[PDB]
Design a protein around this ligand. Sequence first.
Ligand code: CL
Ligand code: CL
Lengths: 340, 340
Amino acid sequence: LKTKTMEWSGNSLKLLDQRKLPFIEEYVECKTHEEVAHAIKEMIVRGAPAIGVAAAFGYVLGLRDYKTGSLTDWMKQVKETLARTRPTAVNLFWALNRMEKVFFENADRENLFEILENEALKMAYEDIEVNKAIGKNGAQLIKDGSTILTHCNAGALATVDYGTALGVIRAAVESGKRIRVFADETRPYLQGARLTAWELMKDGIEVYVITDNMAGWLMKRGLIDAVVVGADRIALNGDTANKIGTYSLAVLAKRNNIPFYVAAPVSTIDPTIRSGEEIPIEERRPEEVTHCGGNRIAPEGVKVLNPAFDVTENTLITAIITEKGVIRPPFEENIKKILE
Amino acid sequence: LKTKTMEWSGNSLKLLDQRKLPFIEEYVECKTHEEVAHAIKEMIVRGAPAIGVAAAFGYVLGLRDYKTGSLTDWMKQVKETLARTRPTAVNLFWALNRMEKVFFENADRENLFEILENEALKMAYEDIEVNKAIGKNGAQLIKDGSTILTHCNAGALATVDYGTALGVIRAAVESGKRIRVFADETRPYLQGARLTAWELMKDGIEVYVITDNMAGWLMKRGLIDAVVVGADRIALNGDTANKIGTYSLAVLAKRNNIPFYVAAPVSTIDPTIRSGEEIPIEERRPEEVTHCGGNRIAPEGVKVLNPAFDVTENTLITAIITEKGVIRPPFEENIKKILE
Ligand SMILES: [Cl-]
Ligand SMILES: [Cl-]
């Protein structure tokens, strides 16, 4: 397992420090499940899909960290320390739960480490495959020669590889369609300007960066043919939690009769919730808002709010692109079909 | 004439360097009509209202710069050099035109300089007064104990003093109403986080700064009672041109049944245009987007778009707060009444 986002050295997990791009391309080596937790918590690694696989490995390292007392209790704490990092994206729990299950069924096997590491590996290789499929299904919805607006970074850096929303793009381009992407810088973290822009230019795909308060006007001016974004948590309802600001675009998209698509793997669909009001919303540190890449921009001692995600009601979504097909209204009715 | 935004030393114009706040509070001295132009062009001074008075003074300096040839041709050029700075805000032309008229009628007067400078001063003293009236008229629309979202900086630093949209706030507070403001940082320039936050904290008014992609969700969550912003150019139609991102707020406001108010002096209403499609929209340098206040944030050699304003159709505006009253639908019909 070796890609731009992460690399598995058998006994450690290397993560591209996404909080340092687009200028610095260094890596962070995680050796302790606590470090992977830290890398996730600090957003060194990020993007629902990639948080899971990365979480799965930190779990494997979790075993390699074991020393005394009960193995079960300790593996339970490793899982708890990793899950306690970031709320919203359900991929994290989905990964952890899948891994813990393997564990409970091989805890007595002497080749435990080999077995667990194997699933994590099996998992990463599936994400890239799942993504290329999402890209393929989404491509058919993108008419040649169009301008697609995106949000956050639902691409290579947000997954093991290829990406979800950006995967749909790479696939349309691969099919041979002239395409250009308007990418919101997406503050405060600036995934758009620092990550999406970067991996897209590095792939030879036409890219423009715009401030978040621009998307609206540009849609009204008729420069955007479609809006495609990723997700962190989709409910049985179809409501999807994604990077703060995704909701507003959805609203603006309806007002300008512009298709709004959510590209995400089935693993992002939380089967335990009915609607989007049940999705936990992460609140991050005040620094992210008062600063911008290092420098403080707001006055000293100012109050702020910092939700990292918002929720878009399903009625504002045209369709959900999955590795198993394009889901359309009635969502609750169709998602239930795909789930099985 | 002495306020935080600008000061008239009789033979030079001192402008608070708004592109350095909230940390550095230095001033820039303009002695040539060209320097005032430069200050305007670079946004050392900014905010429709303040751009006018500042332009009016750079005009008197224009006379002070006179040396040879025809006095009329030179003053015409001074006016042209000053008007060629920033497109959108009509306050600039309104000011320049008012000043040139005074000039044309006193050109042969021995006390020309004293006369022209006198109008400029008379103009500054009127703006502050006009604002306090806008503030008062708007205060009545704000219910005690409410949370108000603003955009850009339509406050003290955008006018000679007091401000327009923020004037409405200062006034509601003066009346004795518990009030707090959610101020969008407003990228790329960050007028919100750097200016609105600053002058509001310095006035002892509860303030929170949020990234632009947040307003939408926060409105849906029910934390915002009303949205009040300023304007750069309002048409007879009622459509108003304001800082890029204002249009989206208006849209998000309608969706969440939230009052949207535009506070601006009559001098911002352009009488020569019928609708908002006739408003010129300024496009500024790409650096403003690829950089954030100081450091480069986007990849080297990336494409971007940079509109400095967008247009909000009148049908999305609840009312326009003026020093002459609260204008309501039918705008075209009512605005025609306020003008006469
Ligand atoms: Cl709807
Ligand atoms: Cl409407």
